């Protein structure tokens, strides 16, 4: 069969990590997503993952909307799907980070959702906890989503063109998990890298990241 999200997949008995087929909320169109079932309680739908620098994240508004990459590795699932889902019910957002020294951390938001494309997939976050900072690394009141061909930030600049990747930039902001991938011998001092200010700072480019969602009622 097919499911609404990875939470439905796990609750239905499929408790192993892997690619599953989700279905869009009011229709039959389907989409593949990676499900993390063996960490943090499982039932997690991965919406973004970086782990090796294999995928180019300097994509268009359209690409960020429908999603790109491969679910078996690094990818972005799709803004449209995530918007539809997160406006179905209350979802939590978990952001897991890994540095090049073997350390890890995460930020958890009690409520997360994206507005329709009409409001530029503006992000909405509430209730931060976790080990990756006391202050949210994602600007807060959420900003519109910005891309190479979509300047929707609050900067007298083009944050996406200056830092690379699509993100909810402000006057850029303390984060960008979709920035340039830098390996261990060159991840220090890089402002266009993969950053989460309140854990490793603005110059430290991370080894791996994952953004995943799961309903609050899980």
Burial class (CB in 10 A: 0-12, 13-18, 19+), 135: exposed
- Residue 15's CB: how many other CB atoms inside 10 A? 13
The first and second tokens of residue 27, run together, are 């229709």
Q: CA-CA distance, 91 to 162, in Å (whole number)?
A: 31
Q: CA 99 to CA 188: how far, in whole Å?
A: 11
Burial class (CB in 10 A: 0-12, 13-18, 19+), 169: buried
Known binding residues are: 151, 153, 155, 157
Instruction: List, as residue ranges, the binding site for Ca(2+).
Output: 151, 153, 155, 157
Check residue 54 and give left, alpha or beta (phi > 0: left; psi -120 to 50: alpha): alpha
Distance of CA 116 to the CA centre of its chain: 17
Q: Which of 4, 3, 7, 2 is nearest to 215 (CA)?
A: 7
Q: Which one-letter DSSP state was computed for residue 14?
A: -
């Amino acid at each position: 069969i097919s499911f609404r999200d990875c939470a439905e997949v796990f609750k239905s008995g499929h408790t192993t990590n892997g690619i599953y087929t989700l279905t869009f909320p009011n229709s039959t169109e389907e989409i593949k997503a990676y499900c993390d079932m063996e960490a943090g309680g499982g039932g997690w739908t991965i919406i973004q993952r970086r782990e090796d620098g294999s995928v180019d994240f300097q994509r268009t508004w359209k690409e960020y909307k429908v999603g790109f990459g491969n679910p078996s590795g690094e990818y972005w699932l799709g803004n449209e799907f995530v918007s539809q889902l997160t406006n179905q019910q209350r979802y939590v957002l978990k952001i897991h980070l890994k540095d090049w020294e073997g350390n890890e951390a995460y930020s958890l938001y009690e409520h997360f959702y994206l507005s329709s494309e009409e409001l530029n997939y503006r992000i909405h976050l509430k209730g931060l906890t976790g080990t990756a900072g006391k202050i949210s690394s994602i600007s807060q009141p959420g900003n519109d989503f910005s891309t190479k061909d979509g300047d929707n930030d609050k900067c007298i600049c083009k944050c996406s063109q200056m830092l690379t990747g699509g993100w909810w930039f402000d006057a850029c902001g303390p984060s960008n998990l979709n920035g340039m991938y830098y390996t261990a011998g060159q991840n220090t001092n890089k402002f266009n890298g993969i950053k989460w200010y309140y854990w490793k700072g603005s110059g430290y480019s991370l080894k791996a990241t994952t953004m995943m969602i799961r309903p609050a009622d899980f």
